[PDB]
Structures are given as C-alpha cells and as structure tokens.
Amino acid sequence: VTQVGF
Amino acid sequence: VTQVGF
Amino acid sequence: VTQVGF
Amino acid sequence: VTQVGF
Amino acid sequence: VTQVGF
Amino acid sequence: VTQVGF
Amino acid sequence: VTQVGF
Amino acid sequence: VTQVGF
Amino acid sequence: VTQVGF
Amino acid sequence: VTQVGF
Amino acid sequence: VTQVGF
Amino acid sequence: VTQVGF
Amino acid sequence: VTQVGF
Amino acid sequence: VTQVGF
Amino acid sequence: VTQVGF
Amino acid sequence: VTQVGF
Amino acid sequence: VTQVGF
Amino acid sequence: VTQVGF
Secondary structure: OEEEEO | OEEEEO | OEEEEO | OEEEEO | OEEEEO | OEEEEO | OEEEEO | OEEEEO | OEEEEO | OEEEEO | OEEEEO | OEEEEO | OEEEEO | OEEEEO | OEEEEO | OEEEEO | OEEEEO | OEEEEO
16 A cells, blocks of 8 residues: 555 | 545 | 545 | 545 | 546 | 546 | 546 | 555 | 555 | 554 | 554 | 655 | 654 | 655 | 654 | 654 | 654 | 654
8 A cells, every 4th residue: 555645 | 635545 | 636445 | 536446 | 537446 | 446537 | 456646 | 635544 | 555646 | 644554 | 744653 | 555645 | 743653 | 654744 | 743652 | 664744 | 663753 | 663853
C-alpha cells in the first residue's frame, strides 16, 4: 500500500 | 484527497 | 479525489 | 473524482 | 468522474 | 484494476 | 489496484 | 489529505 | 494498492 | 494531513 | 499533521 | 505501507 | 505535529 | 510503515 | 510537537 | 515505523 | 520507531 | 526509539 496525496 | 487502502 | 482500494 | 477498486 | 472496478 | 480519472 | 486521480 | 493504509 | 491523488 | 498506517 | 503508525 | 501527504 | 508510533 | 506529512 | 513512541 | 512531519 | 517533527 | 522535535 502506497499512498501519495497533495 | 482521501485515500483508504488495504 | 476519493480513492478506496482493497 | 471517486475511485473504488477491489 | 466515478469509477468502480472489481 | 487500473483507474485513471482527471 | 492502481488509482490515479487529479 | 487523509490517508489510511493497512 | 497504489493511490495517487492531487 | 492525517495519516494512519498499520 | 497527525501520524499514527503501528 | 508508505504514505506521503502535503 | 502529533506522532504516535508503536 | 513510513509516513511523511508536510 | 508531541511524540509518543514505544 | 518512521514518521516525518513538518 | 523514528519520529521527526518540526 | 528516536525522537527529534523542534
């Protein structure tokens, strides 16, 4: 699980 | 941004 | 952006 | 954008 | 955009 | 399952 | 499951 | 940005 | 599960 | 930014 | 920024 | 589990 | 910044 | 578990 | 900054 | 568990 | 457990 | 357990 939020 | 991963 | 992954 | 994947 | 995939 | 939305 | 939303 | 991963 | 949102 | 991972 | 990891 | 938020 | 890790 | 928030 | 680790 | 917040 | 906050 | 806060 990899999550990138911006 | 809302992220839910499992 | 709403993301749900499983 | 709403994404649901399983 | 609404995406549901399973 | 690959989802791309923009 | 890969989700890209923007 | 809210991220929940497990 | 990879999630990218922006 | 709120992150919960387990 | 709130981070909880376990 | 990797979470990046900004 | 609040961090809880265990 | 790696969390980066800023 | 509040940090609790165990 | 690695947490970086700023 | 490594926590860096600033 | 390493904690750095500033």
